[PDB]
């Protein structure tokens, strides 16, 4: 055949892959963690958005830390040979490096390690996308008026917020990041490469949202998401 280029992930396997959505709304009383009003809006929006991208969506609600680890282990042991990619969305409380089960924390590294290139061989060389709506600390942004491969290769972490910062969720509309991510995927997934979609998400979150609070400490605050890419190729949700 003619000249070939290898700059984009092969996304024309028989299946796009799994989209695992972990939606933690209600936490065990002993943890002292508040319920996450608005997260069901996020979970429904993600289910519909990824359905239209032809992902096999599995929604899970209110999982303990043990259930999260077991679920991720089990999913990583499925045969993904016929799948182009893998997506996991985590909606919960968090801190830097941590997402909360309903009864306590899970290290994000423990979750993602199951999918390392050496530990999930049917995903080696395929994009592994972790979308994380959770706090990464307690900082607030005041804003300003205007051949081997590495085992860590081929992961993308689409964080809702900058390292060290709270992440904002509206109890009626859903989280700022997930609202914006779904809108940009709906508008651009048939048009733009994934990093360019996520850059539009960054702009939407940064420009269109600002917190309103009766508490001066939490009022008029801003958010920038954080794209963390270890991908080695361009990612388009469509194929030719």
């Amino acid at each position: 055949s003619g000249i070939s280029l290898d700059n984009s992930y092969k996304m024309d396997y028989p299946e796009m892959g799994l989209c695992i959505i972990i939606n933690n709304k209600n936490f065990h009383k002993s943890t002292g963690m508040t319920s996450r009003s608005g997260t069901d809006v996020d979970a429904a929006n993600l289910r519909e958005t990824f359905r239209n991208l032809k992902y096999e969506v599995r929604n899970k609600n209110d999982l303990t830390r043990e259930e999260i680890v077991e679920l991720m282990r089990d999913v990583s042991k499925e045969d993904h040979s016929k799948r182009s990619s893998f997506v996991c969305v985590l909606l919960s409380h968090g801190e830097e490096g941590i997402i909360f089960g309903t009864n306590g924390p899970v290290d994000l590294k423990k979750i993602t390690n199951f999918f390392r290139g050496d530990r999930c061989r049917s995903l080696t060389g395929k994009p592994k996308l972790f979308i994380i709506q959770a706090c990464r600390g307690t900082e607030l942004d005041c804003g300003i008026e205007t051949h081997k491969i590495p085992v860590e290769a081929d992961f993308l972490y689409a964080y809702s917020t900058a390292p060290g910062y709270y992440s904002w969720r509206n109890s009626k509309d859903g989280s700022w990041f997930i609202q914006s991510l779904c809108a940009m995927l709906k508008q651009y997934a048939d048009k733009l490469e994934f990093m360019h979609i996520l850059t539009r998400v960054n702009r939407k979150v940064a420009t269109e949202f600002e917190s309103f609070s009766f508490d001066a400490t939490f009022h008029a605050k801003k958010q920038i998401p954080c794209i963390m890419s270890m991908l080695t190729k361009e990612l388009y949700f469509y194929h030719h």
Partner: peptide, 4 residues
């Protein structure tokens, strides 16, 4: 608006 609430934080996570």
């Amino acid at each position: 608006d609430e934080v996570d």
